[PDB]
Structure 1
Amino acid sequence: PRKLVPLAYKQFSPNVPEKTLGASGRYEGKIARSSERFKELTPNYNPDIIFKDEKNTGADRLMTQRCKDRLNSLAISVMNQWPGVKLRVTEGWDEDGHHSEESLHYEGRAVDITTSDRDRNKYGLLARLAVEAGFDWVYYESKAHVHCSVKSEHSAA
């Protein structure tokens, strides 16, 4: 076994920009509810993940399959790491534009996460778990959350 080292505040892994091929790839444009690419999104109803749903639309559950797969892996790891605690998503797909111009939140490929107990002391390690769970980019973005993202299925040629 290897010792798990938490990410530092503001650290990202891999240590390259989010939208590079070695990380989460490219911004492929906003997905609107009315758009064809809306079917790229699938709702995650994993019983072991808490969704904040702060906008009361259920949008934070809607994500790509790869995002769902990595998130579900992380959900198991979080429960393992801190028995009694669960993975919590505070932001997923954003229909409103509350991030930078080319956010992967706009296309259901990024989540902001915490632990269910909102213990900010856990977030560095939570970030490390997200890396081990196979998220393509993980960024300890604020003291209040970790930003995790995935590649699309449109770069493999």
Structure 2
Amino acid sequence: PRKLVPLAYKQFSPNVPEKTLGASGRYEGKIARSSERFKELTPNYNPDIIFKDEENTGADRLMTQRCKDRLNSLAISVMNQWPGVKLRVTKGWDEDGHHSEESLHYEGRAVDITTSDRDRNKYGLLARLAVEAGFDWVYYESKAHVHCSVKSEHSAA
């Protein structure tokens, strides 16, 4: 077994920029509800994940299949790591311009996460679990959340 080392505040893994091929790849443009690319998004209703849904639109649940798959893996590992605690998404797909100009939040490929108990002391380890779950980039971006993203299916030729 490998020793699990939490990420430190502001650390990202892998240790390269988010939008490189070694990580989550390119920004492919905002997805709006009216977009053809809205069909890239699938609603995640995993009962073992809490969604903050601050906008009251369900947008946090709408994500690409790869994002869903990694999130669902992470949900198992979070409950393994801290029995009685669940994975929580505090921000997923952004319909409303609240991130930097080319954020993967705009295309349903990034989620900001916490544990369900909002114990900030758990977040460094949560970030390491997100790496182990196969997220393509994980960034301990603020004391309040870990930013996790995935590559798209559009760069493999």
User: Which category describes the TM-score, using the shorter chain as reference length?
Assistant: over 0.9
2: CA distance between counterparts of 1:97 and 1:111? 15
**1:31, distance to aligned residue in structure 2 (A):** 0.1
Q: Helix, strand or coil for the counterpart of 2:76?
A: helix
**1:24, distance to aligned residue in structure 2 (A):** 0.0
1:50-80 deviation line (CA, Å, top 9, x unaligned): 0000000000000000000000000000000
Q: Helix, strand or coil for the counterpart of 1:29?
A: coil
1: CA distance between counterparts of 2:122 and 2:145? 10
**1:148, distance to aligned residue in structure 2 (A):** 0.1
The answer as to 2:63 corresponding to 1:87 is: no
Q: Helix, strand or coil for the counterpart of 1:47?
A: coil
% same residue? 99
**1:11, distance to aligned residue in structure 2 (A):** 0.1
Q: Helix, strand or coil for the counterpart of 1:111?
A: strand
Q: Helix, strand or coil for the counterpart of 2:77?
A: helix
**1:137, distance to aligned residue in structure 2 (A):** 0.1
**1:134, distance to aligned residue in structure 2 (A):** 0.1
Counterparts of 1:5-154 in structure 2, within 5 Å, are 5-154=5-154
Q: TM-score, normalised by structure 2?
A: 1.00
Which stretches of structure 1, 4 residues or longer, exceed 4 Å deviation after superposition?
none
2: CA distance between counterparts of 1:122 and 1:54? 22
Q: TM-score, normalised by structure 1?
A: 1.00
Q: Report the aligned-residue RMSD.
A: 0.2
2: CA distance between counterparts of 1:63 and 1:97? 17
Size of the aligned set, in residue pairs, is 157
Structure 2: stretches of 5+ with no match in the other structure: none
